[PDB]
Amino acid sequence: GMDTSGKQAEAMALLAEAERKVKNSQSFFSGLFGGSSKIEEACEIYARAANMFKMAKNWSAAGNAFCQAAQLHLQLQSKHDAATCFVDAGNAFKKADPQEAINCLMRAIEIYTDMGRFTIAAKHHISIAEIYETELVDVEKAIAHYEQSADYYKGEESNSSANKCLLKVAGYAAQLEQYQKAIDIYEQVGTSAMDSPLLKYSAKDYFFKAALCHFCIDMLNAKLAVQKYEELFPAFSDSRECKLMKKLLEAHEEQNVDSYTESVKEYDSISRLDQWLTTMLLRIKKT
Amino acid sequence: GMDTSGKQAEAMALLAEAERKVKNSQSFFSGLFGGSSKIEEACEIYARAANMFKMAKNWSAAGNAFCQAAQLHLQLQSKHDAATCFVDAGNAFKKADPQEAINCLMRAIEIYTDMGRFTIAAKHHISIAEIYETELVDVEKAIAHYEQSADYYKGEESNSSANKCLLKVAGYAAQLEQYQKAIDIYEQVGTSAMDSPLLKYSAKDYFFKAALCHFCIDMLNAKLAVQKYEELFPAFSDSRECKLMKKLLEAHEEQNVDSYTESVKEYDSISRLDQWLTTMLLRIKKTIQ
Amino acid sequence: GMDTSGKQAEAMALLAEAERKVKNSQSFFSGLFGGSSKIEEACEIYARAANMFKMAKNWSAAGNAFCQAAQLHLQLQSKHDAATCFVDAGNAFKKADPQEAINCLMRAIEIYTDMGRFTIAAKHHISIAEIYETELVDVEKAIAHYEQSADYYKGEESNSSANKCLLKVAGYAAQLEQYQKAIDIYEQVGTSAMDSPLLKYSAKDYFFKAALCHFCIDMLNAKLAVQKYEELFPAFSDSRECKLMKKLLEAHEEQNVDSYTESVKEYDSISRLDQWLTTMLLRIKKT
Amino acid sequence: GMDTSGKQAEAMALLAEAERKVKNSQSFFSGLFGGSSKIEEACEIYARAANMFKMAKNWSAAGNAFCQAAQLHLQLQSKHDAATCFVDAGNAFKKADPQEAINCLMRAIEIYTDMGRFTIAAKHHISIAEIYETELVDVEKAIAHYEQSADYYKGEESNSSANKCLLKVAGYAAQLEQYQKAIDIYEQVGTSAMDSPLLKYSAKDYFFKAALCHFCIDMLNAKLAVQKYEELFPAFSDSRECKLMKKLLEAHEEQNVDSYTESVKEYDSISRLDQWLTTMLLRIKKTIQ
Amino acid sequence: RADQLADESLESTRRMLQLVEESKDAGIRTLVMLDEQGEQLERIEEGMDQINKDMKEAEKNLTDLGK
Amino acid sequence: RADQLADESLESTRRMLQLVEESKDAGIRTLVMLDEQGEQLERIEEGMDQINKDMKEAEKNLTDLGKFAG
Amino acid sequence: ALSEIETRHSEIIKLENSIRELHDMFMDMAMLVESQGEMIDRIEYNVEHAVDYVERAVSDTKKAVKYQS
Amino acid sequence: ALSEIETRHSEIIKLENSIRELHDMFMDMAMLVESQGEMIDRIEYNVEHAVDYVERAVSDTKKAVKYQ
């Protein structure tokens, strides 16, 4: 309330002093050649002004201030502080208008990968992909960014990080009526989860999904895949999932639609499903 | 104990030494103009005396020395060190005199938020709220501090902390303050967890709280909101709380207090109460006429 | 290995040329007065020879080297380095002969307290207390060390560590039959967790133990104490522990050993007991 | 790939520049003086080329560049940048061709153990062991490396990781080595966690494998071992896995294949026999006579 | 022999009781450890922040003085 | 009285199944969560030790150089 | 024999209490784990920043102050 | 009634299996958490030592500059 109003008043004041600063500092460099200290101090003026803009609940102007400071600082032939300014501007633009946030974050990733550090590049890429997913619909860019992030993580031996990104990519790929990539990623991660002392318990789940997606093509291939997986994983038959898959196969063989639906409904009753599985099952039933 | 007595004696000695040091420094600045060292080693004497004194189990004078040292240090254009000394002095005064601790902590928070750090400011705000409510009996200031902390946290997408703070604020407001704020906060937070990996079977309780508050307002609003939630979130249909709420609604409809009493008794028998639901249920029962 | 022990001999030769380095202080530092850095490199060669000894599994020699290097280095300067050397010597002495480790750790404690780094000092106090427990037999000194550590920890609001330390102190004191202290500590820790959502479920156990200690001294007051606990915590009676204690105390009204014996055996028939509880019951129930 | 095509083009450019920089090095060691800084800039450009190569998917060239840069760097009386570059080269060689990775990691380990940091050396040792077992078909060197890692860890008081290291090494040795070491390590580890009240809920399994190891040699000493175990640990006698032992030994005394087979098959229920234990049971069965 | 089946059900109930209570008791202490972890994390974060600020201000002041 | 037998039995089976499955899922996901923080702590330790070495050696060399100047 | 099934009712109610407690325990362990991770990420960010800045500043200043002579 | 008791037999088997699984899950969790705690302790030690060292470093360096 009043705090914000006063902050914005002195904010306009400080910005006026900052434009005065920049103009008279270039003038003083021309007429006296004082060096570059005045440029630096002007940079901290921009920084503190942007901080208090953020204090004042006006994000767009804060992002503009951060971007201006970053560009002047990199014009001063120093990178990392400029990097921090750009990433701060992107975080500010996250809410409200995020489009230019994409460009700035890309610039930050560009400089980071130019230096040679990779993990933060992966973090920024996943953030950008999250922005596209949450606010836009061009899922193709999301696929590209997630794949790049997974590549970076897996290249740096961060095995755990890569799996999450690959799973997200596989889910979205299966969403857009493409099945080869989903099959490959699911089976690869499932096999890589075979010997994990901790993850072994969950290793079944991924395999199950694969079979389901693999069933979208035909029936005999699905049987071959499921029996192959059962051979590769002897304990797979213990869980109810194999029972359910076998029921689905046998029912769909003999056009027993009602029993198929009732078995699905019973499995739902014992444990409910999500949108993804329900949608896939319904799409399967369509034939 | 010998340690306490000796520490107090040498602490008085060090304080007198520092006082004479500062007066002689005022003298020497004109006399010799040595710069600013005199004051800084005077500050070091103050800090060492303060830490040994706090080790000596005596508190108030320790925080007083911390405040004096930080004041003289900030006199020399050094801010962050004085701010850390302020924070330490507040932690010391916490057990001596709340008012001075609150003042110094507010000073530290303002200087920090001027610096540009928000998370530390939010942490200090939470500490201020906790001390304000735990021993001193007042809520409104606590609500304001918690709200500011949540705002600062959300400023840097620290979602979990802001969630917790807002939940506490909503609970406190519902207890004493009016209900609209509670409605909005509880409903928003609850419906911001329907999609997730572990935070998926917890949310239920939040909606239940909201329903009770709605019911506290009026019966028609109660039923309308219950239907709204029923449609919006399918799983709430099959919650035990849902059947409990329906039974309570239909019992209160006909003015048969025995049904309400037996229902609440059975609910309590199955699972233990929380001391917050019981008060609301008693208040509801108070208006059966 | 064996020739690394030969280079342990050559590291005693390193110590011999270090003896020549102190012979520098004896006569040659008159012309090398500025060779304080020469003293520093003498300390460095001391340190790396000591590390060679550590690799050689000669614990006594390694501790000798550490203590000598610390003594030479603590020339009223670089105190924290001397503290690191002293704590390293104490860790080395931990195995084999640990007595002098206590003195060295005490000196390090004094240095840190002069500095004011309380957490490290308290951790080292815990270390000396546990070595007292596991190697020597004195317990009262362990009690004093634990008390001092708990005070230091509680100074800076690190409550949980202080609570566990006080719990151990209470257990030892109860073994030493000074029940007032044990009951005080147990009650404090019990009724200081009732209303936080993370430690909420422990309370039962603490109360139960407190009851027993109370029940040891004045059985008549035990009923009032348990009633006070029950009223303070409504959900205490539901737990099995309160029921068992009620059965024991009510049975004791009549002299029937069989009843309590069967009760305790039945309770043990659901979970095993510990030395502490079993010993306390055996001692107390004798009269 | 156009991206990778331009990446490799600029990689070749930087390689030409680095060749000109080694020409600079030879002209500044024999032709000029103070090239140490010039060859330091050469090292900087080499590190740039190596990192960008790593980004280019050409792993072998990246490793070669890292190794060349490190070996050149070693000559400037500097050891830590040496370590870093050697470790980076080893990580690069991990994939593709790992053989020289072992040598470079050994060099780095030597440097570190010369310096004095032990934990990092032990971590690199365990990495060497894991890569050697996963991709190289040989196990005895794995035993040696795990042994050294265990020595280092238990020397520095980090008991926990040491415990697992020793456990794995002993378990593996059981498969292809005399069982005495297995018995010793298993017995040692059992009691060394029997006390702490969390990790100790599991030692049953360790004593169980120890019993299997004793049994695989002879029966009588196995009976003695099991009776001693239950004497020391009263709560392992009235257990679950435990009885499998009494029924199995009683059956084996009578030389009756059917009962032993049905008993192990029975035990299967509610816990799938794993790869190791199964092999053990088959091995003991094969020599019933 | 359905009564023997009921007796098997009763012993299964006994096993359920033991396993459930055992898991409960272990988990409680799991919680206490995960609380201690969170307590330590705040202190390490604060130390990191203080070191960062001190290093930054000191190095920049020295660099400015060098000019 | 078999009616309430059947009613309590169906109630027991349904509740037991749902509770058991919920516990299983919650646990499994916590397990899979822990590994990330494991390796994160690994990385932070690596960075911290690198910082320690670099700063220590820099300062000691700089004190030596300052002594040379002085 | 019916008192036996009454005892069965008692023990199943005991199971009810235990299982409900277990469920709530897991629900309350979850958020703590999550918040721990949320602190770890930030501390990682800051430490990386600190190391990078220290390295570059010290290196550049050292080369400058050593070569200007 | 017979089918009901057969279903309850299936239920008892399933409950046994699930309980057992939870039992193993918990023990593993415990172990891993303890390891994490130990590593946290060591890193905290190192960080605090670095803090002290750098503080006294800056102090001495600024005093040396003052000497100049």
Numbering used by the authors:
A (entry chain F), C (entry chain H): 0 to 286
B (entry chain G), D (entry chain E): 0 to 288
E (entry chain D): 17 to 83
F (entry chain C): 17 to 86
G (entry chain A): 191 to 259
H (entry chain B): 191 to 258
Question: Can I see the authors' text?
Answer:
The membrane-anchored SNARE (soluble N-ethylmaleimide-sensitive factor acceptor protein receptor) proteins provide the energy to drive membrane fusion in various cellular contexts, such as intracellular trafficking and exocytosis. Supercomplexes of NSF, α-SNAP, and either a syntaxin tetramer or one of two binary complexes of syntaxin—SNAP-25 reveal atomic details of SNARE processing and show how sequential ATP hydrolysis drives disassembly. NSF comprises three structured domains connected by flexible linkers—the adapter N-domain followed by the D1 and D2 AAA+ domains. Six NSF protomers come together to form the active form of the enzyme, a homo-hexamer.
We observed a nearly symmetric ɑ-SNAP—SNARE subcomplex comprising four ɑ-SNAP molecules coating a four-helix bundle. Even without further processing, this structure was recognizable as a parallel 2:2 syntaxin—SNAP-25 sub-complex formed by two syntaxin H3 SNARE domains and two SNAP-25 SN1 SNARE domains; this binary 2:2 configuration was previously observed in crystal structures of syntaxin-1 H3 and SNAP-25 SN1 domains and was unexpected as we prepared the complex with full-length proteins, implying that two independent SNAP-25 molecules contribute their SN1 SNARE domains to this complex. To improve the resolution of the spire reconstruction, signal subtraction and local alignment were performed as before. This approach improved the reconstruction of the spire proteins to 4.22 Å, enabling docking of a crystal structure of the 2:2 syntaxin—SNAP-25 SN1 complex into the density, which was of sufficient quality to assign characteristic side chains, to identify the SNARE domains, and to determine their directionality. The 2:2 binary complex was fit back into the full reconstructions, enabling modeling of the full 22bin20S. A representative 22bin20S model (class #19, 3.56 Å) and ɑ-SNAP—2:2 binary SNARE subcomplex model (class #23, 4.14 Å). Four ɑ-SNAP molecules bind the 2:2 binary SNARE complex, with two SNAP-25 SN1 SNARE domains and two syntaxin H3 domains. This configuration locates two independent N-terminal portions of the SNAP-25 linker bearing cysteine sidechains often palmitoylated in vivo near the membrane. Symmetry was not enforced during local reconstruction. Note that the near-twofold symmetry of the bundle leaves some sidechain densities poorly defined.
